[PDB]
Design an enzyme around this catalytic site. Structure first.
Site, PDB file in Angstrom:
ATOM      1  CD  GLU A  35      -3.098  -0.671   0.108  1.00 10.50           C
ATOM      2  OE1 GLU A  35      -3.973  -1.518  -0.143  1.00 10.50           O
ATOM      3  OE2 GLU A  35      -3.080   0.464  -0.420  1.00 10.50           O
ATOM      4  CG  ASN A  46      -8.840   6.986  -3.984  1.00  9.22           C
ATOM      5  OD1 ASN A  46      -7.904   6.222  -4.220  1.00  9.22           O
ATOM      6  ND2 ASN A  46      -9.293   7.211  -2.757  1.00  9.22           N
ATOM      7  CG  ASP A  48     -13.949   8.762  -4.927  1.00  9.90           C
ATOM      8  OD1 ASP A  48     -12.750   9.039  -4.703  1.00  9.90           O
ATOM      9  OD2 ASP A  48     -14.664   8.158  -4.096  1.00  9.90           O
ATOM     10  CB  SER A  50     -11.752   9.872  -1.611  1.00 11.35           C
ATOM     11  OG  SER A  50     -11.600   8.781  -2.499  1.00 11.35           O
ATOM     12  CG  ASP A  52      -6.520   5.614  -0.681  1.00 13.21           C
ATOM     13  OD1 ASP A  52      -7.681   5.970  -0.448  1.00 13.21           O
ATOM     14  OD2 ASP A  52      -6.266   4.597  -1.364  1.00 13.21           O
ATOM     15  CG  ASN A  59     -10.993   6.159   0.365  1.00 21.68           C
ATOM     16  OD1 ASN A  59     -11.000   7.369   0.239  1.00 21.68           O
ATOM     17  ND2 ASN A  59     -11.460   5.344  -0.576  1.00 21.68           N
TER      18      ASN A  59
END
Ligand SMILES: [Cl-]
Ligand SMILES: [Cl-]
Ligand SMILES: [Cl-]
Ligand code: NA
EC number: 3.2.1.17
Length: 129
Positions: A35, A46, A48, A50, A52, A59
Site C-alpha cells: 500500500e 482516487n 472520485d 477522495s 488515501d 480512504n
C-alpha cells in the site's frame, strides 16, 4: 518515516494487530508494503476525489476528514493528517475499525491482490518479536 520490515512488524504487534480478527501479523506487514512501501507519509488521490493516507492508505471517503471530500464520512473520527504521523497508533486504531466492518482485509486492494493466499509469514521471518 519509512519503516524497516521488522521494525514495523514489532510496532504492529505492540499495538495489538497480531491475529486481530484472525489476521496474522504477516498479513498486516504485507499490506503495508504494497500500500505504502512502509512510508507513513504516502498519499494517493482516487478518481472520485477522495485521498488515501498513510502506511495503510486509509480512504477519506469513509474513514477520516480531510476537508476536501464532499459528502464523505469520518468513521475513525480523526483528521486524515493524523494518519501520516511517524507514530502509527492512529493508523492502527482506524485499521482495527475497518477490518471489523464485515469485509475483513479485503478492504485493502493490495492485500487482496498481492498478499491473500500467499505465504504471508515470510514477511515477519527473521524478526525479533
Ligand atoms: Cl504471519
Ligand atoms: Cl470533507
Ligand atoms: Cl475476516
Ligand atoms: Na471524510
Amino acid at each position: 518515516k519509512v519503516f524497516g520490515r521488522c521494525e514495523l512488524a514489532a510496532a504492529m504487534k505492540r499495538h495489538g494487530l497480531d491475529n486481530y480478527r484472525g489476521y496474522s501479523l504477516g498479513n498486516w506487514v504485507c499490506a503495508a508494503k504494497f500500500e505504502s512501501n512502509f512510508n507513513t507519509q504516502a498519499t494517493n488521490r482516487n478518481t472520485d476525489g477522495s485521498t488515501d493516507y498513510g502506511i495503510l492508505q486509509i480512504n477519506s471517503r469513509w474513514w477520516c476528514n480531510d476537508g476536501r471530500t464532499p459528502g464523505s464520512r469520518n468513521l475513525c473520527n480523526i483528521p486524515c493528517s493524523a494518519l501520516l504521523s511517524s507514530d502509527i497508533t492512529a493508523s492502527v486504531n482506524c485499521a482495527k475499525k475497518i477490518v471489523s466492518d464485515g469485509n475483513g482485509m479485503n478492504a485493502w486492494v493490495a492485500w487482496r491482490n498481492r498478499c491473500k493466499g500467499t505465504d504471508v509469514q515470510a514477511w515477519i521471518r527473521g524478526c525479533r518479536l
